[PDB]
Amino acid sequence: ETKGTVLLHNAQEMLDFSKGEEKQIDAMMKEIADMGVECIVAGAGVGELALHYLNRYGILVLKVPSKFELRRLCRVCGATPLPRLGAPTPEELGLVETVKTMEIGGDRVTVFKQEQGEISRTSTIILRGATQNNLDDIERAIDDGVAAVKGLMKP
Amino acid sequence: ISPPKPDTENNIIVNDYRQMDKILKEERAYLLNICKKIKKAKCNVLLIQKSILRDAVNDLALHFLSKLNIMVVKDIEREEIEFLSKGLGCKPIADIELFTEDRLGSADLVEEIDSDGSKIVRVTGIRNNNARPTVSVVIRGANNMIIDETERSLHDALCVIRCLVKERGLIAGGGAPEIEISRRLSKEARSM
Amino acid sequence: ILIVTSNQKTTISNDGATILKLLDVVHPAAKTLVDISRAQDAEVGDGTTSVTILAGELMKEAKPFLEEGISSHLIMKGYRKAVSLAVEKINELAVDITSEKLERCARTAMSSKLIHNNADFFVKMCVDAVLSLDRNDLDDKLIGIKKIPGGAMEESLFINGVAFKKTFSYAGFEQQPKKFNNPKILSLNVELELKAEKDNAEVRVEHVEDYQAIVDAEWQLIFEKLRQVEETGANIVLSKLPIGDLATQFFADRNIFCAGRVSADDMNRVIQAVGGSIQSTTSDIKPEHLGTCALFEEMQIGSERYNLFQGCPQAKTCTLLLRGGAEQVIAEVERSLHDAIMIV
Amino acid sequence: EMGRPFIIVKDQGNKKRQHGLEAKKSHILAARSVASIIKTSLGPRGLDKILISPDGEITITNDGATILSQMELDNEIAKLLVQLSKSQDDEIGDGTTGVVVLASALLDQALELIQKGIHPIKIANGFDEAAKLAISKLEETCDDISASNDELFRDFLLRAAKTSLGSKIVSKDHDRFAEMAVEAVINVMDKDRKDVDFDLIKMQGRVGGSISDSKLINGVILDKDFSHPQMPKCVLPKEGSDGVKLAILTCPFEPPKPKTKHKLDISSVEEYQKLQTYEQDKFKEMIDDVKKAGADVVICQWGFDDEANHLLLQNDLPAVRWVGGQELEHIAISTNGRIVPRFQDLSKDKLGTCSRIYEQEFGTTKDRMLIIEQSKETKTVTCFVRGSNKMIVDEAERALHDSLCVVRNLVKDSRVVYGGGAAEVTMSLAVSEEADKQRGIDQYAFRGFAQALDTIPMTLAENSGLDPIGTLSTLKSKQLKEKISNIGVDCLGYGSNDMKELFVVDPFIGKKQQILLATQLCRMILKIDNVIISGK
Amino acid sequence: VQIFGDQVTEERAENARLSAFVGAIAVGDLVKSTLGPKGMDKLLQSASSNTCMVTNDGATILKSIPLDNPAAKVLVNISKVQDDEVGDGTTSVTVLSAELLREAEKLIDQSKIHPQTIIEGYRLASAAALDALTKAAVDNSHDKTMFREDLIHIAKTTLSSKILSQDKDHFAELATNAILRLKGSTNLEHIQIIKILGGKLSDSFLDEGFILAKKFGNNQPKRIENAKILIANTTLDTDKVKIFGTKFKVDSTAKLAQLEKAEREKMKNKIAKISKFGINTFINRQLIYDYPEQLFTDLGINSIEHADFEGVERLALVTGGEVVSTFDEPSKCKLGECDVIEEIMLGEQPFLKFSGCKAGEACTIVLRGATDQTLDEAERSLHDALSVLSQTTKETRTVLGGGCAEMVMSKAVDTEAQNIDGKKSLAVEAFARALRQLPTILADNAGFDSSELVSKLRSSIYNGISTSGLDLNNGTIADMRQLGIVESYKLKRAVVSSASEAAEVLLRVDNIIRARPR
Amino acid sequence: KTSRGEIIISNDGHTILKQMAILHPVARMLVEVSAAQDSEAGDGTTSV
Numbered sequence A: 001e002t003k004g005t006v007l008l009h010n011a012q013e014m015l016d017f018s019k020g021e022e023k024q025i026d027a028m029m030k031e032i033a034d035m036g037v038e039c040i041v042a043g044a045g046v047g048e049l050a051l052h053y054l055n056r057y058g059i060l061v062l063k064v065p066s067k068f069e070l071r072r073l074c075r076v077c078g079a080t081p082l083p084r085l086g087a088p089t090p091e092e093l094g095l096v097e098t099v100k101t102m103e104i105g106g107d108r109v110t111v112f113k114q115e116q117g118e119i120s121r122t123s124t125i126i127l128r129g130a131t132q133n134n135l136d137d138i139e140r141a142i143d144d145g146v147a148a149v150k151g152l153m154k155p
Numbered sequence B: 001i002s003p004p005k006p007d008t009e010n011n012i013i014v015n016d017y018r019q020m021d022k023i024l025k026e027e028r029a030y031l032l033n034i035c036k037k038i039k040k041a042k043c044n045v046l047l048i049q050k051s052i053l054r055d056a057v058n059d060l061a062l063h064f065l066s067k068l069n070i071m072v073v074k075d076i077e078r079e080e081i082e083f084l085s086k087g088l089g090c091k092p093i094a095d096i097e098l099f100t101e102d103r104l105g106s107a108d109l110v111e112e113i114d115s116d117g118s119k120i121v122r123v124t125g126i127r128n129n130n131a132r133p134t135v136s137v138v139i140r141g142a143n144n145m146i147i148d149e150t151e152r153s154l155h156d157a158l159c160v161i162r163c164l165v166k167e168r169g170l171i172a173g174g175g176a177p178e179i180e181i182s183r184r185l186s187k188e189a190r191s192m
Numbered sequence C: 001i002l003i004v005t006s007n008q009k010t011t012i013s014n015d016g017a018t019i020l021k022l023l024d025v026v027h028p029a030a031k032t033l034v035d036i037s038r039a040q041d042a043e044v045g046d047g048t049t050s051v052t053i054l055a056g057e058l059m060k061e062a063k064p065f066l067e068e069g070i071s072s073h074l075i076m077k078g079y080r081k082a083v084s085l086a087v088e089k090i091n092e093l094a095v096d097i098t099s100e101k102l103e104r105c106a107r108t109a110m111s112s113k114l115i116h117n118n119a120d121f122f123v124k125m126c127v128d129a130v131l132s133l134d135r136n137d138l139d140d141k142l143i144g145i146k147k148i149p150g151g152a153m154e155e156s157l158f159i160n161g162v163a164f165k166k167t168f169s170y171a172g173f174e175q176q177p178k179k180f181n182n183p184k185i186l187s188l189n190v191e192l193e194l195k196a197e198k199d200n201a202e203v204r205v206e207h208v209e210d211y212q213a214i215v216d217a218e219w220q221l222i223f224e225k226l227r228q229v230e231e232t233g234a235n236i237v238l239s240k241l242p243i244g245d246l247a248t249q250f251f252a253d254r255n256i257f258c259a260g261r262v263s264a265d266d267m268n269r270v271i272q273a274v275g276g277s278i279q280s281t282t283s284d285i286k287p288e289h290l291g292t293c294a295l296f297e298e299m300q301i302g303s304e305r306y307n308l309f310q311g312c313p314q315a316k317t318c319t320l321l322l323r324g325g326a327e328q329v330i331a332e333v334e335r336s337l338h339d340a341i342m343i344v
Numbered sequence D: 001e002m003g004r005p006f007i008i009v010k011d012q013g014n015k016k017r018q019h020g021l022e023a024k025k026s027h028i029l030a031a032r033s034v035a036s037i038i039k040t041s042l043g044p045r046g047l048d049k050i051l052i053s054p055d056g057e058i059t060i061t062n063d064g065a066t067i068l069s070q071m072e073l074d075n076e077i078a079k080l081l082v083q084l085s086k087s088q089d090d091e092i093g094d095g096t097t098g099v100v101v102l103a104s105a106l107l108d109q110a111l112e113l114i115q116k117g118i119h120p121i122k123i124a125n126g127f128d129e130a131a132k133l134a135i136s137k138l139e140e141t142c143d144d145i146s147a148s149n150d151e152l153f154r155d156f157l158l159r160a161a162k163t164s165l166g167s168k169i170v171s172k173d174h175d176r177f178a179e180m181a182v183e184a185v186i187n188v189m190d191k192d193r194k195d196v197d198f199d200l201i202k203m204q205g206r207v208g209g210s211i212s213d214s215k216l217i218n219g220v221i222l223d224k225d226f227s228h229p230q231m232p233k234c235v236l237p238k239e240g241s242d243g244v245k246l247a248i249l250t251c252p253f254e255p256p257k258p259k260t261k262h263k264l265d266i267s268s269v270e271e272y273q274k275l276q277t278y279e280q281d282k283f284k285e286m287i288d289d290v291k292k293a294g295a296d297v298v299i300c301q302w303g304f305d306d307e308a309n310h311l312l313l314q315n316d317l318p319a320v321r322w323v324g325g326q327e328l329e330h331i332a333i334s335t336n337g338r339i340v341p342r343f344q345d346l347s348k349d350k351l352g353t354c355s356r357i358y359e360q361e362f363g364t365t366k367d368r369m370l371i372i373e374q375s376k377e378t379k380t381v382t383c384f385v386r387g388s389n390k391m392i393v394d395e396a397e398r399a400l401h402d403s404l405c406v407v408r409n410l411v412k413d414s415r416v417v418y419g420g421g422a423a424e425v426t427m428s429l430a431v432s433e434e435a436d437k438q439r440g441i442d443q444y445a446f447r448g449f450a451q452a453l454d455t456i457p458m459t460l461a462e463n464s465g466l467d468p469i470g471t472l473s474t475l476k477s478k479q480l481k482e483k484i485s486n487i488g489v490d491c492l493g494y495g496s497n498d499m500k501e502l503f504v505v506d507p508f509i510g511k512k513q514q515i516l517l518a519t520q521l522c523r524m525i526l527k528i529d530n531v532i533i534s535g536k
Numbered sequence E: 001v002q003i004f005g006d007q008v009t010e011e012r013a014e015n016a017r018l019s020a021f022v023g024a025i026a027v028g029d030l031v032k033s034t035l036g037p038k039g040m041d042k043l044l045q046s047a048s049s050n051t052c053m054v055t056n057d058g059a060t061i062l063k064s065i066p067l068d069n070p071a072a073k074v075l076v077n078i079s080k081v082q083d084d085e086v087g088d089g090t091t092s093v094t095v096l097s098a099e100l101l102r103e104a105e106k107l108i109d110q111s112k113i114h115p116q117t118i119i120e121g122y123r124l125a126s127a128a129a130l131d132a133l134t135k136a137a138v139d140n141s142h143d144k145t146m147f148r149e150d151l152i153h154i155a156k157t158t159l160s161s162k163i164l165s166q167d168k169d170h171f172a173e174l175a176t177n178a179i180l181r182l183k184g185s186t187n188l189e190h191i192q193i194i195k196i197l198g199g200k201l202s203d204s205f206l207d208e209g210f211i212l213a214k215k216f217g218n219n220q221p222k223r224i225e226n227a228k229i230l231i232a233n234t235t236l237d238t239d240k241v242k243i244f245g246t247k248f249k250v251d252s253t254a255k256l257a258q259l260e261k262a263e264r265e266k267m268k269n270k271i272a273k274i275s276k277f278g279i280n281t282f283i284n285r286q287l288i289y290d291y292p293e294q295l296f297t298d299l300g301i302n303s304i305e306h307a308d309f310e311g312v313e314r315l316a317l318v319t320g321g322e323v324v325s326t327f328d329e330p331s332k333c334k335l336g337e338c339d340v341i342e343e344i345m346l347g348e349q350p351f352l353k354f355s356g357c358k359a360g361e362a363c364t365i366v367l368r369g370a371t372d373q374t375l376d377e378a379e380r381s382l383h384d385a386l387s388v389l390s391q392t393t394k395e396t397r398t399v400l401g402g403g404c405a406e407m408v409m410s411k412a413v414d415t416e417a418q419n420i421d422g423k424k425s426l427a428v429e430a431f432a433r434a435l436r437q438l439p440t441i442l443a444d445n446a447g448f449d450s451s452e453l454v455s456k457l458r459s460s461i462y463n464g465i466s467t468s469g470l471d472l473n474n475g476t477i478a479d480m481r482q483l484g485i486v487e488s489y490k491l492k493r494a495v496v497s498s499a500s501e502a503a504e505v506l507l508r509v510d511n512i513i514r515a516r517p518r
Numbered sequence F: 001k002t003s004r005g006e007i008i009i010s011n012d013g014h015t016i017l018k019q020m021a022i023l024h025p026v027a028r029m030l031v032e033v034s035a036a037q038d039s040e041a042g043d044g045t046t047s048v
């Protein structure tokens, strides 16, 4: 956090500094890859060297550059995040069967459909329509309907 | 005369706390031993030119120069260095290694009188092996506009003396040669 | 319809999405049409205008009923109840055709614009564009086509790969051969030039003897980075980041072509065409991940150089060069094909 | 309106619209306004035109693309004609003026058919069928030249070289420019006579001298002098040697320093003296490396300081500074040398070879421009064009560029046709013949394209000052009497409308491109109904 | 349908040719008074800072004056190329190229000749014109004494047009000696023209040496003898090493006192290497600071500072030595020699006088004149004189002037007009009649007859005397070999080719397109 | 009185002509003649 700058006094450190970053990033992926994970949701920008070793073993990368977008996804699979770059705990690893990528609105979208077994929460509703203004009012109608479901819990 | 700072890039690093006392002792000693070698040549008056990129004479150095009875004058123009060396017969000094007694000049009295709120530093008496002596003349007056014209009026006076020593001979003015040359060409004009 | 906006950008088109896109519509009720058109284009890419004219006539037909004492909900209940039968009726009008194994559907989608009359030549190669794509993927970025101001539309041809502009003239570009019999493609991401290594620059040196060695070490590792690319036999080198003059001249001596200044969307199309992979490190290069094709030939196209790949046994990419007189001709040929390619 | 502000598009009151018949008349008359500019320019008896840029600089040009490129216009219909001439200029490089007048000829004849009430799509489909029919006929009638040997194939380039130079200034010395243009391609060509690289030959003009002083030199043009000019200007090779052993370097003469920012700390006077020794030994080792390599002339990209001037002068080693990277691309291909990055990789195999290096003045004080020449055939030719004016030498560049492009079209196999108005009339009478049995509704559409093709001969009749009706009547009657279709309108009046004899040839790919770009643009302009334009 | 934008002036009618033709006539008539020996000088009033400029050359005049006509730019550009190429004959190109368009105007209007026919006649007429100079030239390379006399008469011809018509007898010897000094080096940058106001115009001189614009620094003497000159280009003053990342990790100021001493030791060591040559004068282009200046005093070496890089080239060639750096190897290096060096004063500024040098491959000219404008005119004149004489060495062939060059072209041009029967003969005759006007304006500037004096020159040449020409001091025909006026072959080849090709420009123009100014 | 705030008295014709800003260029040539008379001779700058 405080003035991260290289320092190389001689040529012996110059030769090993380029390979040291490759071996260090690779060594951290070994403990992550041996646990059988195939998709990792990142919270901020991911480097290119880390990306080269992730897609080697076929690990999917997902961007969620915000706090609430990252918290809503943990409730689906039921995972406990940890900021460390070490081994995820097996109890904390989430369960997702399939991750599909199909064309719905012409743009690229990533889906996380679960199955009847190992149900999840915080589901979504794909709302298709022609006019963007009608999407806004129908979306708030679901909020009114979801708000009506809240009326059953407290009383 | 200043603390050490070469033109090449440098950076002083202090690793231990006791080194601060040492460098402070060596800074004044670097000024002291150079001033000590001025006493060895018994040079009594110093004249420093306009200093660039740093102060000419450090305030810490003035204490050593003022107690040893040395007059200090700074901010002299660069083109005047040829004038002082030619007049006083003193060769300039660019390094203490070349600072010797034979290169210095001589003078009987360097007095700075107080008169009319305007200081003048005048050297009385010059003696040296020099075939090209110098001369200096001050100007006094009411205001600067008369000082400027008194300078240019003297320039026209010296240029007349410059012309006579350049080209030998002279003629009587007062409109004489204009009428004489007009008479002479008018005599020949009717023949051609 | 010919439209020129405030920035003096000429455009000519016969589409419902493109015409309403350039026109900055400030009226609130009129932007529903922009939305319907955009929506049909998005989900389909054809028949945008029809939708807008039908929308217009239903609202124009609802005008005299609103002048009468008919309420608003009564008119909406009629269309919403009638459209349910129209969708079911269209399912009966449509056929369950499976016999006869594309060609005819493309001719109708090209109507109302330029290439309808030239459908005999464009439909023959346009049908082959989607056949390269397999089922359930249907990647639209693989059908990315670029602009070439200059030429005649008749001289176009079908390409089994990619053709991308170099966008930079290197010092050792002419020394490389333009024709390889058995080329091998390898995609890179590391920056091949002499500069700072990893986002920082600070090097302390005490002894002057080591000052010569640290400079030679930088010259040693940069050729070590290039020699690992040379040892695997990669004839074509590609990288998103720039490539310096030091690297391209090292490749220029021993007949190794290189190029740079390309986008990520272009790089993703290169991998699926050659069937290789991305490697952002020179040490982890292996022979198996190198893509191959039939031949290579750089050709003069509209005073612009393009690196052609073609003849692959299995290509996921179709990318044709659009040449034309005006900049609107190449644009109209793009939009006409983009609407027809969605239909097929 | 109903009192409320009825606005739809942003900036409602600024932009306008135009529809109906008045929208069409704005289009056709806009083409006639541009066609009148091009009609008095086309042909060998044409006249140049001055285009004053906003910055005060002028360009005396008679090519349609450069005229329309530097022309400030407002009407969009002419702006599409600006791009059509630019389209013909970039790829083929021949016929810009022709397309502009031919597209206007289709537009002028389409005005009469719009008055009759024919739909524009039937008009556009008629020219598309007529254009392909004319191309299919002209592809059969033209003869192939590949059967002849190389001695006669050189003459066919001289036929087209004199055709392209003429109609342009540089039409005096045009007999030597034709030989100079053909001699440039003899050096730079493939052994199979196919797909020659045009990028190897760059354009270079020089403001000074006269047109007669221009000559051929195989080498590079640098606009700079040697370093520290005390050496002799013209360096010669050794008595026994393969060549001058040219050396090129992309490394400046300095001590090796890191590319990253560094901090070399000297904590002692002994290390400071070693820095002085390290400073001198690098320059001593550097000049010994190029000495042992045997190089005579050295080319440096990133320059060097004044210390290397005396070291290079004593060893009889000329050198230069501030040589751009684009020129080093040209130096390596010309002298067949490999550019070494550094001195450690310096070897005698990478050095180039050329005949001699020398420099001249060209006058009083202008600038010292370097010249290089080869002793044999190489893969690089640099045209050394002189001129009495800046506009003369500027027009001579684009004129000679079009000459090399016309020869570049003939490198493609079996593409030759005799022009001079013969290609237009021979494609015109067949379209009218097809209309007699293919009448339909598009009978007048073929007649419009038949009359539109003949306008280029009538354009040549106006510039030459001959009667147009008598000219087209004689050419049409001669084409019907005899099926030999190489007779055209000869403006230079050498007698004989016959033309293989005159020696006028144009490339076949260039001629079919005239009607393609003309028909392809006419199909686009006829589609326009609404004309929305915004205020500046 | 106005396709062009707002404020777009276009001329697609007869006014376009009239506007282009009247522009050249205005540029042509502007320079008719500046041609010939009796021509009048012109005065330029600058719009910025009131910086006046007096000049007789048409290139400096037309470049300074603003002209918005596109036709004026061609006359400006053809004059700029002629000024840079040869350095003389610019007004002849301007007046001849304008007269060719003037003579071509009546063919377009009265006779109604095609523009392609007028240029076609000028092609054949210009071809016969240059062929006349092929046979009319004379090669004086076999004898140096006759070539020495040819440079006199060429200097008489070029210098007579400027204000130095009286003093050309003295500067003709000064001009030719500078050319024989350079012994073939045609680079005009190797002559330093020192400008000095005051004194009589004939007080100019040409000393055998190189005159510096500066003086010695502090105490070095004025008068010395048997001085060895050594020239250097490197810093030699507070040496900042080639890498700027150098630093000193100072632990104590006492050690930094040794580091600054070490900078003085290496500089003291560098000056010690200068003394190994055994020299008495040292010259460097960079300005010399105080510390290295002092060490030259004990060694007895003189020092000169702040010499310009263009002067180092002149300084090296007059001295005949070589510029030396990296002084470890004095054996391979070379240095010059000189007999005596002395500081002089010409006006207020002192100068250093060199005399008795071995090499004489360059020189310096000291001009003396009343004003700065007369002195400037003098420079422009000598530059034009030395430029023609410099190219005369590489182009030894010469051509006689004084109306004989233009007439012997017309004799051959009129002969060829009959063998080209048709309408082209009027164009070739127009090219002939355009050449008759150059001796006409040369007679009009002196106040003589335009018709009878030209008619006598017409009849004299066809009788079989190809050496007759105009003599302006008396107003009669005289022999050119006796008067001694002659021009170079490159000059007459240049003005005929430049004026011919200049006429081809504004005859092929019909439309004038003017976009908006920026 | 010059353009800036400096004031100067002058009997010398060279300094009079130098400080006077003349619009006419031919009259401005006399400023250079007085400069030439001042540089060469140094006396009689108004007599010339």
Ligand SMILES: Nc1ncnc2c1ncn2[C@@H]1O[C@H](COP(=O)(O)OP(=O)(O)O)[C@@H](O)[C@H]1O
Binding pocket: D041, D042, D043, D044, D062, D063, D064, D093, D094, D095, D096, D097, D098, D162, D163, D164, D166, D167, D168, D419, D420, D421, D489, D490, D491, D492, D504, D506
């Ligand atoms: N010397 C010539 N003799 C006969 N016809 C010529 C000659 N030169 C050019 N032409 C004809 O003039 C027509 C127009 O050519 P031009 O407009 O000069 O070329 P571009 O359109 O490329 O500028 C061509 O169709 C060509 O056949």
Ligand SMILES: Nc1ncnc2c1ncn2[C@@H]1O[C@H](COP(=O)(O)OP(=O)(O)O)[C@@H](O)[C@H]1O
Binding pocket: E034, E035, E036, E037, E088, E089, E090, E091, E092, E093, E157, E158, E160, E161, E401, E402, E403, E442, E470, E471, E472, E473, E485
């Ligand atoms: N004393 C003389 N007698 C005869 N002719 C002269 C004399 N002096 C000059 N001339 C003629 O006047 C012409 C002057 O041309 P010049 O003014 O040098 O042209 P430019 O100024 O354009 O170089 C020369 O061609 C020369 O023949």
Ligand SMILES: Nc1ncnc2c1ncn2[C@@H]1O[C@H](COP(=O)(O)OP(=O)(O)O)[C@@H](O)[C@H]1O
Binding pocket: B156, B173, B174, B175, F011, F012, F013, F042, F043, F044, F045, F046, F047
């Ligand atoms: N004492 C005098 N009596 C009479 N006439 C004089 C006297 N002194 C000078 N003159 C004349 O007056 C003139 C003065 O010129 P001056 O003002 O000195 O010119 P400048 O000021 O330009 O040097 C001289 O030319 C001289 O003839």
Ligand SMILES: [Mg+2]
Binding pocket: C046, C047, C048, C109, C111, C112, C339
């Ligand atoms: Mg459609």
Ligand SMILES: [Mg+2]
Binding pocket: D094, D095, D163, D164, D167
């Ligand atoms: Mg042409």
Ligand SMILES: [Mg+2]
Binding pocket: E088, E089, E158, E161, E384
């Ligand atoms: Mg002259």
